Design a protein around this ligand. Structure first.
Ligand SMILES: Nc1ncnc2c1ncn2[C@@H]1O[C@H](COP(=O)(O)O)[C@@H](O)[C@H]1O
Ligand SMILES: [Cl-]
Ligand SMILES: [Cl-]
Ligand SMILES: [Cl-]
Lengths: 366, 161, 287
């Protein structure tokens, strides 16, 4: 009376995962092995991580890339939620680097092209696997890289940033460790940047046993480059490991890079914002809400610096919405940004937004 | 196949599971690492069970009980239809200073000799955002890039104020 | 029902919408001089109008509007055109023509060409029925540029081989032409009363030296030189093609698209021309 989910006899626990226990499943009849994430409904009920697990399920569902661990099925029982996935014999790329040495230039690149390939597919689907590390990059029998924990992944939205500063300290981007909000893919490039370092060197580019000093190292963007390293790869790392996101390499910038280009298999790839006010951030919110009330617009308060304002069209009798988020530019200045909230016909949505916005600017400060 | 995992987060050398679903017969729980486990496919409905933990019968006090008219205390499980749809099962489980301006909202596609009515593919992150020109001869110029399907359109409103 | 008719009937307007474009909208309340300046400073031959009070796009502002204002209200080179300098768009639209023609992105290119000829227009706003907003402005040039892609790869029918003369495409009767000495004011006049887009400029000798067009007129706005229209058409063109009757429709189409021009002067044996063929006529003859 051995534990099994259908014809898959469950075996050894290969890991604990971001969410649930990952066990092996060798098929009773065919001997086919699968990896099974067991999300215990007794533990998932507990938090509001219920969303963070519906996010992993939903994202991963439609994917099918050669270097992303495949989701075969997701089966729900009263007890738990099982996620049947493709199983690989090689385990952690991390343990491979530990056990074997640093990877040779040829091998380092081979594996890097694969990890970047998967990472590209992800972004191309507006999915961003925050928490990219060799611990989450698995190897198969002929050691092809396979991306694996989409628990800390997230769906990129049109006109929206993301805060959740997640992932292992070493592999976490300066803006992540800093807590500042990012677009998404910059972050995965900075992680893929350290992965390449670990590949060619066998060590980490930013490391310290004291966490805050490590955080400073990461933000200083300064790391060692051994003599054995090729200057061309050094230049690529210099670009991926840029502290400023606006100066940091893009997947395109990497595809364009000569080091990355060498022996690449073809199967892998195919005016100013808002109004700025120098007033007190609380006083700005105060100034805005008495101006919103003036325009008779309805609204709801999310964050103290975030408002969702609605407006009944006096002519077409239809509703128009916008997101008002206060930011901070200088050490002395503050900026108010107007984003459109696309509803779901008699008069244009786009122009109705401009009108709603202009009506406010007509009275507000600088 | 949708089997229900029974767990025994207790101690013990030998643990068994007796249920209505197996006609009150001692089914052995396999010691995982932490708990003693068994996985059985149980149909939609009410099911009572108990545990034989080291020659002593008990319910899991953690799990719901049911006391009979006869004095027997058994555990109980309601296997609902909701317990099978992955997203339906997800819903049933539910029950200081302003941020620093991200650098991506400073890059304007209107700012940066082909078509004058032709612009580059904008970064998704600035779609729906309001960028306005300084108020001139009593005229305020407003712009926003929006996407319709695989196409992007930067609309410019020339509005007197 | 030619192959092109069935080709245009198959393709959505959306297909012609570029990957990332600019769209300039004017509120009807905006000053009319500002409106024209904006067309120039943004680099766009036209812009849709928005009535904020009516909460709908009530029309379009083109160079044709400038040509009609600039002519109706030009008192002299000594007195500034008051009306233009102090009119709103809504006040001028009240003067002229005392409704907005558009198309859905999910509508055929056939319905788009049909609309252009049927409504006797050059600009066609593509407006989304779902959102209610204008996405792109469909021009004859864009439509023919794309149709060209089809006929270069697809085998040419018998009528494409035939001559412009024997096919009878384009206006050849009562062709409005200007002279070298003709002033800009007279030129605008002809544009207004003859409803034409361009006027060929003949020499004192009689050979066509140049060509004045609705587009040339915007340089008056651009170079802020509009206040004197007494200047000869040649003096105006100081800021800065042909075809024969006997030529094939194919050869003619290739020239119109390559040159990226809106018409071709149709010459006889000599410098002096027998008529004019336009993109409108080419597109009407393929739909
Ligand atoms: N100079 C001209 N004289 C007479 N008809 C013209 C002239 N230029 C264009 N047309 C005609 O005007 C119609 C519409 O063309 P267009 O206004 O040029 O887009 C066509 O039938 C043209 O042949
Ligand atoms: Cl682990
Ligand atoms: Cl085995
Ligand atoms: Cl394998």
């Amino acid at each position: 009376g051995r534990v099994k989910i259908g014809h898959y006899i469950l075996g050894d626990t290969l890991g604990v995962g971001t969410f649930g226990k990952v066990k092996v499943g060798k098929h009773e009849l065919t001997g086919h092995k699968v990896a099974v994430k067991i999300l215990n409904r007794q533990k998932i009920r507990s938090l509001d991580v219920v969303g963070k697990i519906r996010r992993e399920i939903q994202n991963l569902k439609l994917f099918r890339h050669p270097h992303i661990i495949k989701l075969y099925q997701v089966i729900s029982t009263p007890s738990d939620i099982f996620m049947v996935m493709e199983y690989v014999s090689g385990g952690e790329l991390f343990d491979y680097i530990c056990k074997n040495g640093r990877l040779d230039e040829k091998e380092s690149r081979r594996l890097f092209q694969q990890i970047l390939s998967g990472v590209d597919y992800c972004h191309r689907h507006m999915v961003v696997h925050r928490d990219l590390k060799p611990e989450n990059v698995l190897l198969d029998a002929h050691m092809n890289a396979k991306i694996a924990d989409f628990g800390l992944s997230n769906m990129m939205s049109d006109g929206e940033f993301l805060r959740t500063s997640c992932g292992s300290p070493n592999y976490a981007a300066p803006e992540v460790i800093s807590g500042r909000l990012y677009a998404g893919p910059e972050v995965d490039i900075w992680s893929s940047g350290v992965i390449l370092y670990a590949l060619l060197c066998g060590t980490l580019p930013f490391d310290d046993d004291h966490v805050p000093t490590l955080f400073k190292k990461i933000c200083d963007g300064i790391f060692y480059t051994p003599q054995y390293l090729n200057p061309s790869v050094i230049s690529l790392l210099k670009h991926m490991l840029q502290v400023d996101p606006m100066k940091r390499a893009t997947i395109k910038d990497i595809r364009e890079h000569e080091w990355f280009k060498q022996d690449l298999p073809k199967y892998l790839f195919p005016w100013h914002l808002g109004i700025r006010s120098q007033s007190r951030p609380n006083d700005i919110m105060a100034e805005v809400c008495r101006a919103i009330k003036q325009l008779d617009y309805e609204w709801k308060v999310v964050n103290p610096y975030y408002l969702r304002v609605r407006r009944k069209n006096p002519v077409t009798s239809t509703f128009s919405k916008m997101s008002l988020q206060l930011y901070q530019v200088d050490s002395r200045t503050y900026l108010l940004d107007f984003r459109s909230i696309d509803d779901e016909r008699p008069g244009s949505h786009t122009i109705e937004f401009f009108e709603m916005c202009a009506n406010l600017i007509k009275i507000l400060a600088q | 196949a949708r089997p229900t995992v029974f767990r025994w987060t207790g101690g013990g050398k030998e643990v068994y599971l007796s249920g209505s679903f197996n006609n009150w017969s001692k089914l052995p729980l396999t010691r995982d690492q932490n708990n003693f486990v068994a996985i059985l496919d149980l149909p939609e409905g009410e099911h009572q069970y108990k545990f034989f933990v080291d020659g002593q019968w008990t319910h899991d006090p953690s799990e719901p009980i049911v006391t009979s008219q006869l004095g027997t205390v058994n555990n109980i499980i309601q296997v609902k239809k909701t317990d099978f749809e992955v997203f339906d099962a997800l819903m049933v489980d539910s029950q200081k200073a302003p941020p620093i301006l991200p650098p991506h909202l400073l890059q304007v596609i209107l700012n940066k000799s082909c078509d004058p009515a032709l612009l580059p593919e904008p970064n998704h992150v600035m779609l729906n955002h309001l960028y306005a020109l300084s108020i001139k001869d009593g005229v305020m110029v407003l712009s926003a890039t929006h996407r319709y399907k695989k196409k992007y359109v930067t609309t410019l409103l020339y509005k007197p104020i | 029902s030619s192959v092109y008719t069935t080709f245009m009937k198959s393709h959505r307007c959306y297909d012609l919408i570029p990957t990332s474009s600019k769209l300039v909208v004017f509120d009807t309340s905006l000053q009319v001089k500002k409106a024209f300046f904006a067309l120039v400073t943004n680099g766009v031959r036209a812009a849709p109008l928005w009535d904020s009070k009516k909460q709908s796009f009530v029309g379009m502002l083109t160079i044709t509007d400038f040509i009609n204002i600039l002519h109706r209200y030009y008192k002299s080179a000594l007195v500034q055109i008051y009306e233009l300098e102090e009119h709103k768009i809504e006040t001028w639209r009240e003067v002229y023509l005392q409704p907005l023609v558009c198309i859905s992105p999910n509508a055929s290119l056939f319905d788009a060409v049909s609309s252009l000829i049927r409504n006797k227009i050059h600009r066609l706003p593509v407006i989304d029925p779902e959102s209610g907003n204008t996405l792109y402005i469909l021009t004859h040039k864009r439509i023919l540029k794309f149709l060209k892609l089809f006929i270069t790869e697809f085998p040419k029918p018998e009528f494409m081989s035939k001559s412009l003369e024997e096919l009878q495409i384009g206006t050849y009767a009562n062709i409005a032409m200007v002279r070298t000495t003709t002033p800009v004011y007279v030129a605008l006049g002809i544009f207004v009363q003859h409803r034409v887009s361009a006027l060929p400029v003949v020499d004192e000798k009689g050979r066509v030296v140049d060509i004045y067009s609705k587009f040339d007129v915007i340089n008056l706005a651009a170079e802020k030189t509009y206040n004197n229209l007494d200047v000869s058409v040649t003096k105006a063109l100081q800021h800065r093609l042909k075809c024969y009757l006997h030529e094939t429709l194919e050869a003619i189409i290739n020239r119109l698209v390559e040159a990226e021009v809106h018409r071709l002067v149709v010459v006889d044996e000599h410098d002096v021309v027998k008529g004019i063929v336009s993109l409108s006529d080419i597109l009407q003859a393929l739909v």
